[PDB]
């Protein structure tokens, strides 16, 4: 018996339905936060709300925090959601590795998809920077 | 056999007594921080202290930090509490997922309650924003 982990194997701990619903929840929470921060009073435009939601889901902090009550309720529910999701991901990945070892470090092939995603994101960001330069020049 | 996952199956790792104690501890920490800030100086009002405690529990960077030793002791003790509680939750969830007592990818049914809670929070936040908007004019 022989096997090799495939690309994007790091998505195994959560079903693809969970990932799709996470993307929809991200976009919806961002738009709802923008909606409640545009009329109640701020810095929460649609783009800045997307950035805030992305920062909150990655548990990496943010430069701006909601002030109004509705914005803070949205932030709290989003923080609870991302805490539960990250805890579930870590716990189930630990379960996967423990069961695999029960039947040795992680190889580069297990996380090769993440590196490919990083390279593609850097290239796309450079392309977007070039496009923004061309547009802002005119 | 494998029982049907519940709506609130994400509360399985910690007993309901621990959840209730966490809620009362959050309320008490907010009250103590507010009292300390007011009596020994306001940036830390009751609502701002509640927001600070909620953000600290979710391990998310907040916009305000205590600037006196008396409140900083509360902040540090609360951070220790939240770190220990989150580590315990993650460890217990990993133990639950590894050993099955009456491993495949986590299904969406396990975390469906989190999505329901998120949508309910967004709806409640929209309702609160509407209420505040109609009250502001009057």
């Amino acid at each position: 018996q022989k096997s090799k982990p495939g690309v994007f194997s790091f998505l195994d701990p959560l079903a693809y339905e969970i990932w799709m619903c996470i993307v929809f929840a991200y976009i919806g929470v961002s738009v709802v936060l923008f909606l409640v921060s545009r009329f109640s009073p701020n810095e929460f435009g649609i783009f800045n709300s997307l950035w805030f939601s992305l920062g909150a889901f990655m548990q990496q902090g943010c430069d701006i925090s909601p002030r109004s009550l509705s914005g803070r309720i949205v932030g709290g529910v989003w923080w609870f959601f991302t805490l539960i999701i990250i805890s579930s991901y870590t716990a189930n990945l630990a379960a996967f590795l423990t069961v695999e070892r029960m039947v040795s470090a992680l190889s580069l092939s297990n996380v090769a998809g993440v590196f490919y995603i990083l390279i593609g994101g850097l290239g796309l960001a450079m392309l977007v920077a070039l496009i923004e330069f061309c547009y802002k020049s005119r | 056999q494998k029982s049907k996952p519940g709506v609130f199956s994400f509360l399985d790792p910690l007993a309901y007594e621990i959840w209730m104690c966490i809620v009362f501890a959050y309320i008490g920490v907010s009250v103590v921080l507010f009292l300390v800030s007011r009596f020994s100086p306001n940036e830390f009002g009751i609502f701002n202290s509640l927001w600070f405690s909620l953000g600290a529990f979710m391990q998310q960077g907040c916009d305000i930090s205590p600037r006196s030793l008396s409140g900083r002791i509360v902040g540090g003790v609360w951070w220790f509490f939240t770190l220990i509680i989150i580590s315990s939750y993650t460890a217990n969830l990993a133990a639950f997922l590894t050993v099955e007592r009456m491993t495949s990818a986590l299904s969406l049914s396990n975390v469906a309650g989190v999505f329901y809670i998120l949508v309910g929070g967004l709806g409640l936040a929209m309702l609160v924003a509407l209420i505040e908007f109609c009250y502001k004019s009057r």
């Binding site: 079903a15 339905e17 923008f34 | 949508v119």
Partner: protein
């Protein structure tokens, strides 16, 4: 501002079409069972059709099958209401936004159009989550090979959610610009 209005109306129209087609079609999920094909069928939201098996070519309304798949057929009926609710909400948003564009003097229409679009998007997300959760919870209890695969109607609903929320953001910005003007 005219370009923003055109884009918002276009996105509303696409969302309405993408949800109407998704509701009206019957290709939500294909499921097949057999011994290692006893039967293979595709099921929508209200009617199921068999394209393989002993009863091939007969479309049965939701009432020849193992109990587990029949329980799945029941559990889809529990999540049925939300797509209809979202369709009604997006249709109301579409008509109110078109009435807003045809009457530029009245500016409050764009805000309510955006609110309705966003509520419709949230309702669609809830419906999809409930549908998938019911399907997964039903198959998890199954006691022979069983394979199920989502269809193109589900992809239509998934894209229509994004279209609705984009239309809502555009409508909110349109109302802000209208008030500023």
């Amino acid at each position: 501002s005219r370009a923003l209005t055109l884009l918002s109306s276009v996105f509303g129209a696409c969302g309405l079409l993408l949800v109407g087609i998704a509701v009206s079609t019957d290709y939500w999920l294909y499921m097949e069972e057999g011994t290692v094909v006893k039967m293979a069928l595709h099921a929508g939201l209200w009617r199921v059709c068999f394209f393989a098996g002993r009863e091939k070519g007969r479309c049965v309304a939701s009432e020849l099958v193992t109990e587990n798949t029949e329980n799945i057929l029941k559990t889809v009926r529990t999540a049925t209401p939300f797509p209809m609710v979202s369709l009604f909400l997006v249709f109301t948003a579409f008509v109110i936004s078109n009435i807003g564009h045809i009457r530029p003097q009245r500016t409050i229409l764009a805000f309510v159009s955006g609110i309705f679009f966003i509520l419709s998007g949230l309702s669609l997300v809830v419906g999809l989550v409930l549908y998938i959760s019911s399907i997964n919870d039903e198959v998890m209890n199954r006691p022979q090979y069983f394979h199920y695969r989502y269809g193109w109607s589900f992809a239509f609903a998934a894209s229509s959610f994004l279209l609705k929320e984009g239309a809502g953001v555009m409508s909110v910005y349109l109302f802000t610009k209208r008030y500023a003007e």
